[PDB]
Design an enzyme around this catalytic site. Structure first.
Site, short mmCIF file in Angstrom:
data_model
loop_
_atom_site.label_atom_id
_atom_site.label_comp_id
_atom_site.label_asym_id
_atom_site.label_seq_id
_atom_site.Cartn_x
_atom_site.Cartn_y
_atom_site.Cartn_z
N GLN A 330 0.63 -1.13 -0.02
CA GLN A 330 0.07 -0.22 -0.31
C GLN A 330 1.07 1.30 0.27
O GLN A 330 1.73 1.51 0.24
CB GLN A 330 -0.98 -0.03 1.08
CG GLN A 330 -1.53 -1.65 1.31
CD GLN A 330 -1.38 -1.97 2.41
OE1 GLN A 330 -0.57 -3.27 1.80
NE2 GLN A 330 -1.22 -1.70 3.45
N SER A 353 5.03 -2.10 0.95
CA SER A 353 5.63 -2.57 0.40
C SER A 353 5.96 -4.29 0.90
O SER A 353 7.57 -4.71 1.08
CB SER A 353 6.55 -2.46 -0.93
OG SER A 353 6.32 -2.88 -1.76
N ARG A 354 5.10 -5.27 1.16
CA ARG A 354 5.72 -6.41 1.04
C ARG A 354 6.22 -7.78 0.46
O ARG A 354 7.29 -7.81 0.70
CB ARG A 354 4.26 -7.23 1.79
CG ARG A 354 3.33 -7.15 2.56
CD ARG A 354 2.36 -7.54 3.01
NE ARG A 354 0.65 -7.77 2.35
CZ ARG A 354 0.12 -6.27 2.51
NH1 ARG A 354 0.45 -5.79 3.56
NH2 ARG A 354 -0.66 -6.38 1.49
N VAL A 355 6.63 -7.39 -0.56
CA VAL A 355 7.35 -7.32 -1.91
C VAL A 355 8.44 -6.63 -2.45
O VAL A 355 7.73 -5.79 -2.81
CB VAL A 355 6.74 -9.01 -2.89
CG1 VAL A 355 6.04 -8.17 -3.79
CG2 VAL A 355 7.89 -9.67 -3.45
#
Ligand code: ATP
Ligand code: MG
Lengths: 493, 259, 44, 468
Positions: A330, A353-355
């Site tokens: 997000q 940003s997870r990845v």
């Protein structure tokens, strides 16, 4: 068997009696008649017995009862290829810029299953948005689904446009899908893209507010089909074949609203917030096609940047939470920061940003990890900022440094920064080399530093760009060169 | 035939009537009957009223039997004003509200005694229980009222401080563990001890241990006082000097021996 | 000191009312959506 | 057999069969679809004179009316046995990995089986250590029992699931099954693949002991609807022969949503917020198969997505009564940078009993809940007035509650991709000791900021000494 007749025209849906041997998503034609020179198409969806409900892709006042319809033999598809580059088109693929007819050799059907799980690879190649805060704190990789969620006038469209502009020499095929946006905004976006020369590699799909609810519903799928063709087959950009694409869906909230209108006009049962129960399936099948394929399936990628508009910064609504669950990260654009002067307003505390954290240039992460840590310390010290003369040297220095870093993150619009400039500026900021610079002049200090590096030291920038991939970026050579450059700049200033 | 005695009393527990209402909604909607509020069919109050009005205490002419019903309802986010909860609240003769806030705060039975009501009232209590629990209810209600001052004010007089202390004593007394029911004589003895100021000097954190030790005392040292309390729990004036002695004596002996 | 504390408390109270009013409005709209869904479903 | 398609409404296909050869309720019918590959539909209803309503579980957007449908005469059958170990399957049991198809000699079991009866139920359970402080202290992961985490959209349900798998899948003592009924094909799968293949147990990878059935979000509603049943059928073979099974079904709510979309297309009367009338029965049919029986034990771990942030939604409300240990993830806790984001007050467990988990563990958990319950009671007082108006003991409990809230946070080894903090594995004994020491009064002098993303109490003390 390819021909049928309309028997009822209603809430944007025609009935098309007697059109058998039509596939479940065929694009019917409605051939032109008196008073209508052009043909308006429709999507046959409810293939019930002796009646074929068809969504009219366009104004429904054009057709009457008794109009002839001809099935085109194709599932709903959008023309795609190299001819689409640099053209503004309808969701159906027809052009609207007036330049000329679209040239294409093959068509890719929209509304297809995403490639799958095995046909994917973890993202490694970064995407340079050009915003200091985004590229330093929320890394974006090729094939990542990053959500730009804000509150009305906050800069989500501006962030997407800056990201599109920065992909000039990065071998990316930007796609900007305008769903439900008013024609004035779409025209201004297209003009801005044209002025900076980014329109040469950008495909714009426009489904404006005045358009029928059938459009604004297939427009993101048309754009995603274009991106899928770029990802799998690829196109020639700057004399080279690029299989990496970036797509901005713009307002997906308006897309969900359009799909809700289509569903309710079809008398489908409403769900939460009157949205149909399959709105999550809508956005998931839209966004899941944005993937980072592995080498054995071509190695292409398709970065997606959906935009979600919230009301009163209510991130816990239905559609925003749906899209958050679908996407990988997000980018929260708070309204309070935007009004306070921090124009690239980012809620860094909750944006993530997870990845893509591992899908970043080693220089950028190596210089921005301590940046993120220091920003966290500043946010922790925001509560104590109210007290005056009650804070020790450490806390006062941390607050001042956090203010300096926030002011540095403040970046003017339409001015993307190359990765070398960004990493140089962060290295300067994070090494106590700006503690003497007053806060209000940090923006002009950064501008002057960038101009100096552009004019006086192109070799430093070239060396940084060539040595941004190394595992240990702060090599002695680049360290001493950039330290000498900043010392020279400070002495001259 | 139960334990050699013809039992004509039944106690029925509907484990969850909200799930029963969900099942009726499912079977009604699959039958395409018109929905009502919250998609439940129109006659769900009729559903549950039919179910619950069959629980009654027949007179001696019709057998004298009885059927006690304990409907159980889960409420989403403690929304008592929902459809099924309000329906079954209207139907039943009493309510027992269990709160997660009280359950987490250590109050294990978690009853919200402020809003839990029993329309039958004292008529459903033994004369000993009725005579002893009136002071309990009054003191607990007044403690709940004065909790507003207890939360903030620290300048309250010794009367209010002692009264808040007594309320805490009673609340800690009600903190019962699981699978350890207390017979009527035991509850009567404990409540008589607590409401007659014999428990005032005991600190709040140790009141549960005090009650457990007191029950061990009565079960081992003085079984005869428990037998006496249980024998004459139905008399109009339970606190007779006879029951009054050998019970205050037991409490005094326990207090003197321990702590 | 009391004046400062009350001013902070009043500011916090006013901020809480704005937050609660924002939350109440969301609950007000959701109540309307629920009713407009049951009545429309009950109509059909 | 040999029917014809009458109507194609969404993914629901109504077909007409001869009068005396109507398919059963759950039979799997097929459209040849040309190209040599067929679309397998599942019957759901029988409407009259040989007319049945089937769910496509596929694209169903390129086929016309009048197409022939072939009735297989059996429900959907999936391979079971050791041949399914280390392979990835569809809802139909067709492998999707690069390896070849399953041989005909492998037993095919229908995906629609009755759940274990009342006699077969096994109520014996014990604590399953997982190394997560909040999970192992407040809502112990129950061995042999169903447990699930309920989170919104921004909270880290996937991160918690991945860390749990990394912690407990190495010492499995048995096989495992993973089923992402509804989840991103990026992090839900194709990244769990890398993690599982990287982990090695004595020259045999964890993936060599795992059966993986996805039916990812991209899939149409039928695949997401029946992928859970496929995974359950694949795991029941191993449970029935005694092997201990770890079952990780991700986002049961996506199974519910697929059921809702299918029901909406099937013409059923909607219930509550557009959900299917048969929500409770579908949840029962799926969940009652996830049970440890007298023949074998299944250590299930599910995930549930709450729409928006509504815990009153029918799907999570239905899930809540089918679990032994409930873990609730809250948006506010995550926004406070507490990555586990578990709400101890709203998270419970059945085995949080002194006879099962330990007297000290039970006492510590009860105190850690009574604190933070006092904090939830005084939240408004603190927000509008401040810490000063509270009494001294109330103040002390409040800062102890804030320290506990900060201390529940814990770095995860799978969080290295966006956070530089190394992961920590805190044993349940260390967690209990740390929280008991914190509640005793030790650590009161330490500022609250030192409890953020730390291991046991010793790490907090070491950090305090390092900062002096
Ligand atoms: N970085 C920036 N610096 C200065 N002004 C900015 C910046 N980003 C956006 N703005 C200004 O903010 C206003 C709105 O920006 P933008 O067109 O991106 O809208 P938005 O917030 O994405 O949403 P909407 O499409 O609903 O208006 C414009 O006046 C634009 O010039
Ligand atoms: Mg905008």
């Amino acid at each position: 068997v390819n021909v049928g007749t309309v028997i009822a025209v209603g809430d944007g849906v025609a009935r098309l009696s007697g059109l058998d041997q039509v596939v479940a998503s065929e694009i019917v034609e409605f051939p032109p008649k008196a008073g209508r020179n052009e043909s308006i198409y429709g999507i046959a969806l409810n293939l019930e017995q002796d009646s074929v409900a068809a969504i009219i892709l366009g104004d429904d006042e054009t057709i009457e009862e008794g109009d002839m319809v001809t099935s085109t033999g194709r599932v709903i598809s959008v023309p795609v290829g190299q001819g689409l580059l640099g053209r503004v088109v309808n969701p159906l693929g027809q052009p609207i810029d007036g330049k000329g007819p679209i040239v294409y050799e093959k068509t890719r059907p929209i509304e297809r299953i995403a490639p799958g799980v095995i046909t994917r690879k973890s993202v490694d190649t970064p995407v340079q948005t050009g915003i200091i805060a985004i590229d330093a704190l929320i890394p974006i990789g090729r094939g990542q689904r990053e959500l730009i969620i804000g509150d009305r006038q906050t800069g989500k469209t501006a962030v997407a446009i800056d990201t599109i502009l920065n992909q000039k020499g990065q071998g990316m095929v930007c796609i900007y899908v305008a769903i439900g946006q008013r024609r004035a905004q779409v025209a201004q976006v297209v003009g801005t893209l044209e002025r900076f020369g980014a329109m040469e590699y950008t495909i714009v799909v426009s489904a404006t507010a005045s358009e029928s609810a059938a459009l604004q519903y297939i427009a993101p799928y048309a754009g995603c089909a274009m991106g899928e063709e770029i990802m799998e087959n690829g196109v020639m950009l700057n004399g080279q074949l690029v299989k990496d694409a970036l797509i901005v869906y713009d307002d997906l909230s308006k897309h969900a609203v359009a799909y809700r209108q289509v569903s309710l006009l079809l008398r489908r049962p409403p769900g939460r917030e009157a949205y149909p129960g399959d709105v999550f399936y809508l956005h998931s099948r839209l966004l899941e096609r944005a993937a980072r394929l592995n080498e054995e399936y071509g190695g292409g990628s398709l970065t997606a940047l959906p935009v979600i508009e919230t009301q009163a910064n209510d991130v816990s609504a239905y559609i925003p939470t749906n899209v958050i669950s679908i996407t990988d990260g997000q980018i929260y654009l708070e309204s309070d920061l935007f009004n306070a002067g921090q124009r690239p307003a980012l809620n860094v505390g909750i944006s993530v940003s997870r990845v893509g954290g591992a899908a970043q240039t080693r220089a950028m992460r190596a210089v921005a990890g301590k940046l993120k840590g220091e920003l966290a310390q500043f946010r922790d010290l925001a509560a104590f900022a109210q007290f005056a003369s009650d804070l020790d040297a450490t806390t006062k220095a941390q607050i001042e440094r956090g203010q300096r870093l926030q002011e540095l993150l403040k970046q003017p619009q339409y001015q993307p920064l190359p990765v070398e400039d960004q990493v140089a500026v962060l290295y300067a900021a994070t090494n106590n080399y700006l503690d003497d610079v007053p806060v209000p002049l940090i923006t002009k200090w950064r501008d002057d530093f960038l101009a100096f590096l552009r004019t006086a030291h192109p070799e430093v920038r070239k060396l940084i760009y060539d040595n941004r991939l190394d595992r240990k970026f702060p090599t002695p050579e680049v360290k001493e060169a950039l330290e000498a450059a900043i010392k020279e700049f400070k002495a001259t200033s | 035939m139960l334990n050699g005695q013809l039992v004509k009393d039944a106690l029925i527990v509907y484990d969850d009537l909200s799930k029963h209402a969900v099942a009726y909604r499912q079977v009604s909607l699959l039958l395409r009957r018109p929905p009502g509020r919250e998609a439940y069919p129109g006659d769900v109050f009729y559903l549950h009223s039919r179910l619950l009005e069959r629980a009654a205490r027949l007179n001696e002419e019709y057998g004298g039997g009885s059927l006690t019903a304990l409907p159980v309802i889960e409420t989403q986010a403690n929304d008592v004003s929902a459809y099924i909860p309000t329906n079954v609240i209207s139907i039943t003769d009493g309510q027992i509200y269990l709160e997660s806030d009280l359950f987490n705060a250590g109050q294990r039975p978690a009853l919200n005694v402020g809003i839990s009501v029993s329309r039958v009232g004292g008529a459903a209590q033994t004369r000993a229980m009725r005579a002893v629990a009136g002071k309990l209810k009054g003191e607990l209600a007044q403690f709940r009222d004065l909790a507003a001052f207890a939360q903030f004010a620290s300048d309250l007089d010794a009367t209010t401080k002692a009264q808040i202390e007594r309320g805490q004593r009673l609340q800690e007394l009600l903190k019962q563990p699981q699978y350890q029911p207390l017979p009527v004589e035991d509850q009567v003895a404990v409540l008589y001890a607590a409401t007659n100021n014999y428990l005032d000097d005991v600190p709040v954190p140790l009141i549960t241990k005090w009650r457990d030790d007191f029950l061990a005392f009565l079960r081992t040292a003085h079984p005869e006082v428990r037998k006496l309390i249980y024998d004459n729990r139905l008399d109009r004036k339970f606190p007779t000097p006879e029951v009054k002695e050998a019970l205050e004596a037991a409490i005094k002996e326990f207090k003197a021996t321990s702590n | 000191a009391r004046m400062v504390a009350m001013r902070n408390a009043t500011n916090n109270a006013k901020d809480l009312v704005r937050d609660l009013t924002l939350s109440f409005n969301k609950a007000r709209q959701a109540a309307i959506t629920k009713e407009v869904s049951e009545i429309a479903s009950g109509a059909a | 057999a040999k029917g014809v398609i009458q109507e194609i409404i969404g993914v629901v296909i109504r077909a007409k069969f001869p009068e005396d050869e109507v398919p059963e309720i759950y039979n799997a019918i097929e459209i040849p679809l040309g190209n040599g590959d067929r679309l397998v539909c599942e019957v759901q209803q029988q409407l009259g004179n040989g007319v049945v309503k089937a769910v496509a579980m596929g694209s169903t957007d390129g086929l016309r009316r009048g197409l022939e449908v072939i009735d297989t005469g059996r429900p959907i059958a999936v391979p079971v046995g050791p041949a399914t170990l280390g392979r990835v399957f569809n809802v139909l049991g067709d492998p999707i990995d690069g390896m070849g198809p399953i041989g005909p000699e492998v037993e095919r079991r229908p995906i629609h089986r009755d759940p274990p009866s009342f006699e077969e139920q096994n109520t014996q359970a014990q604590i399953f250590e997982t190394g997560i402080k909040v999970i192992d202290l407040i809502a112990p992961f129950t061995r042999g029992g169903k447990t699930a985490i309920f989170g919104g959209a921004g909270v880290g349900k996937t991160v918690v699931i991945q860390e749990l798998i990394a912690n407990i899948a190495k010492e499995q003592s048995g096989f495992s099954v993973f089923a992402g009924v509804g989840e991103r094909s990026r992090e839900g799968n194709d990244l769990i693949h890398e993690m599982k293949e990287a982990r090695i147990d004595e020259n045999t990878t964890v993936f060599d002991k795992t059966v993986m059935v996805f039916g990812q979000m991209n899939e149409p509603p039928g695949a997401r609807l029946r992928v859970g049943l496929t995974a359950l059928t694949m795991a029941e073979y191993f449970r029935d022969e005694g092997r201990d099974i770890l079952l990780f079904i991700d986002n049961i709510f996506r199974f519910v949503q697929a059921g809702s979309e299918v029901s909406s297309l099937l013409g059923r009367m909607p219930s509550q917020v557009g959900y299917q009338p048969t929500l409770g029965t579908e949840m029962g049919e799926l969940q009652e198969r996830i049970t440890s029986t007298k023949r074998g034990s299944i250590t299930s771990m599910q995930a549930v997505y709450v729409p928006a942030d509504d815990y009153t939604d029918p799907a999570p409300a239905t899930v809540f009564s089918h679990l032994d240990a409930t873990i609730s993830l809250e948006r506010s806790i995550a926004e406070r940078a507490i990555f586990p984001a578990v709400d101890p007050l709203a998270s419970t467990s059945r085995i949080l009993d002194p006879n099962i988990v330990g007297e000290e563990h039970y006492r510590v958990a009860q105190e850690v809940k009574r604190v933070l319950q006092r904090y939830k009671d005084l939240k408004d007082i603190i927000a509008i007035l401040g810490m000063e108006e509270l009494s001294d003991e109330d103040k002390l409990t409040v800062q102890r509650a804030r320290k506990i809230e900060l201390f529940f946070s814990q770095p995860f080894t799978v969080a290295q991709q966006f956070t530089g903090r190394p992961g920590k594995y805190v044993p349940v004994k260390k967690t209990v000791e740390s929280f008991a020491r914190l509640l005793n009064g030790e650590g009161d002098h330490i500022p609250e900021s030192f409890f953020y993303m730390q291991g046991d109490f010793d790490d907090v003390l070491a950090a305090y000494e390092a900062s002096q």
